[PDB]
Each structure stands twice: as C-alpha cells, then as structure tokens.
C-alpha cells in the first residue's frame, strides 16, 4: 500500500461485466457513475491502482 | 430461487444486468421485500452442481 | 465448496406484497376490538390509522 501498483488503460474496448469473472467479489462500489451503466458512457484513461 | 453471491445486488428495482434482464426483472414501482442468505454448505458439490 | 466467497450460491426468497386495494386476506396477528360508532376515537382498519 506504500507502493501502491498503478497501471494506465487506454487505446482498448471495456467489457466491465467481464470483470465479475476474475475475482469473488460481492459488490463493486462506484462514486460518481454506477456500476449498471458503466458499458454506456465511456471515458479517456482509465488508471487502475492495485 | 439460486442466484451467485455477486449477483444479489441485481435484484432490485432498476437495475439491468444477465439476470436482472433475462430471468427475473422487478418492477420499478416495487413494493416488496428481498431476502437473500448463503448456501454453499447445501448447493455446494466438490465434483460441481 | 473450493469456491471463494461471492461466486458461492446463494438462496432468494422474494415477497412481493399486494397493496389495499380488494378485501384483504392476509393479515397479521392484532385483535379487533369492538365497534364505536358516533365518538371521536383514533380507528385502525386494516392498517390503516
Ligand atoms: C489466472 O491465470 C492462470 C494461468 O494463466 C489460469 O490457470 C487461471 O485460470 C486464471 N484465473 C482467472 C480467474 O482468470
């Protein structure tokens, strides 16, 4: 958590509905959009912090 | 019914999803409750149900 | 069973409840007491105060 792993996404398709097949997660909380309606707006890089 | 545990949260009003827009939809004007509880010790096969 | 917790299965009892609109059937356990007729008395019918 001090060398938090941040990685840039862009150039590429989304699927995020593919994202409940990789880990058991049960919710995947969101501030500012919802995670209904993430496949119809789209945006310009997506950072993931892990 | 049976549903996966990250899928409960599809059961609501308003929400759209595989299940949510293939198997069972709720109305958005619902007036109901959803009860949901864990069975992994009664659904759960170590050759795969 | 080997499964992690969220892709585990999942029981769901839905109840979808059916306004006041018919004579109502399904009620639950309150006495009903007698009727008073031409006083100013607080009055419950069918849950509604
Ligand atoms: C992760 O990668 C390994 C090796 O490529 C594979 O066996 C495993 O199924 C993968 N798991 C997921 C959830 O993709």
């Keep these: 958590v001090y060398a938090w792993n941040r990685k840039r996404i862009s150039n590429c398709v989304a699927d995020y509905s593919v994202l409940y097949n990789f880990a058991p997660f049960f919710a995947f909380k969101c501030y500012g959009v919802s995670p209904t309606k993430l496949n119809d707006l789209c945006f310009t890089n997506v950072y993931a912090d892990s | 019914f049976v549903i996966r545990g990250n899928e409960v949260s599809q059961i609501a009003p308003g929400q759209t999803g595989n299940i949510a827009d293939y198997n069972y939809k709720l109305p958005d004007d619902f007036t109901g409750c959803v009860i949901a509880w864990n069975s992994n010790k009664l659904d759960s096969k170590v050759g795969g149900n | ?49």
């Design chain 3, 1 to 49: 069973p080997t499964y992690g917790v969220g892709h585990q299965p999942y029981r769901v009892v839905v109840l979808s409840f059916e306004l006041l609109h018919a004579p109502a059937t399904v009620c639950g356990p309150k006495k009903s007491t007698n009727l008073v007729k031409n006083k100013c008395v607080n009055f419950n019918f069918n849950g509604l105060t």
